[PDB]
Amino acid sequence: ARTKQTARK
Amino acid sequence: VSQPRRNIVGCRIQHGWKEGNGPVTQWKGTVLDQVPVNPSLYLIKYDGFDCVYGLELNKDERVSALEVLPDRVATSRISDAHLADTMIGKAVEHMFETEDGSKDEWRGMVLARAPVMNTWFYITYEKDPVLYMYQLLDDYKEGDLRIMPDPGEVVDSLVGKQVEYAKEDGSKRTGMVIHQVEAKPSVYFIKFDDDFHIYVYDLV
């Protein structure tokens, strides 16, 4: 349910 | 419960980031740790981004005026640690959802329990090797994480040793090692200068 989009800035 | 100066480890902060000469965008996060080999460096986790970076919050021109917030990172101790201990140092498939909603799992390794935020957990991945923090409890509970299975101490770790490698544009990554992981002594945290990300590597 997590996303790689929120991994970094 | 007192100290002469600093010791902001474990209390969240707010500061702005300026890339080159771009925009001063405002970030707030939590300081997680400091490295003893070079004590000008702190580890940070930002609300919103699961990744953890390493920044010289006071020796770096790029960081903005440093504000230390009165907000408290509620320790909020975890219900049961039995499951947490089963997966420290193992190899697990981390399920990730694309924005379209399609499936994509990455094979990675749960390094150990995190510091300051106890529910959150350290992790590194195979094709992407950097230090991330995820509440893996939530993951395993909802079903997006699975685990595949598996005498007198010697000098062991080589923390503080500067390293070098070979890259393409006539350049080599230059950094140093900063940590020996408790679960597997083979891997180490390494920090490469001109980069603000913490890498987890197996040095055999």
Numbering used by the authors:
A (entry chain B): 1 to 9
B (entry chain A): 46 to 195, 206 to 259
Please, what does the article write about this entry?
Spindlin1 is a member of Spin/Ssty family and was initially identified as an abundant maternal factor in mouse oocytes and embryos at early developmental stages. Structural studies have revealed that Spindlin1 consists of three Spin/Ssty motifs that adopt a Tudor-like β-barrel fold, of which the second Tudor recognizes H3K4me3 or H4K20me3 and the first Tudor module recognizes H3R8me2a, rendering Spindlin1 a multifunctional histone reader for H3K4me3, H4K20me3, and H3“K4me3-R8me2a”(25, 26, 28). Here we show that Spindlin1 also acts as a potent reader of histone H3 “K4me3-K9me3/2” bivalent methylation pattern. Structural studies revealed concurrent recognition of H3K4me3 and H3K9me3/2 by aromatic pockets 2 and 1 of Spindlin1, respectively.
Moreover, we measured binding affinities of 16 nm, 17 nm, and 20 nm between Spindlin150–262 and H3 “K4me3-K9me3,” “K4me3-K9me2,” and “K4me3-K9me1” peptides, respectively. H3 residues Ala-1 to Lys-9 were modeled in the complex structure. Consistently, the H3K4me3 and H3K9me2 marks are positioned into the aromatic cages of the second and the first Tudor domains of Spindlin1. We measured a root mean square deviation (r.m.s.d.) of 0.458 Å between the two superimposed complexes. In the Spindlin1-H3 “K4me3-K9me2” complex, the buried surface area is 231 Å2 for the H3K9me2 mark. By contrast, to ensure proper registration of H3K9me3/2 into pocket 1, the H3 peptide takes on a more crouched conformation with an induced α-helix in the middle and the H3K9me3/2 mark is inserted into aromatic cage from the side. Furthermore, the intimate encapsulation of K9me3/2 mark by aromatic pocket 1 of Spindlin1 is also consistent with a stable and high-affinity association of Spindlin1 with the H3 “K4me3-K9me3/2”peptide.
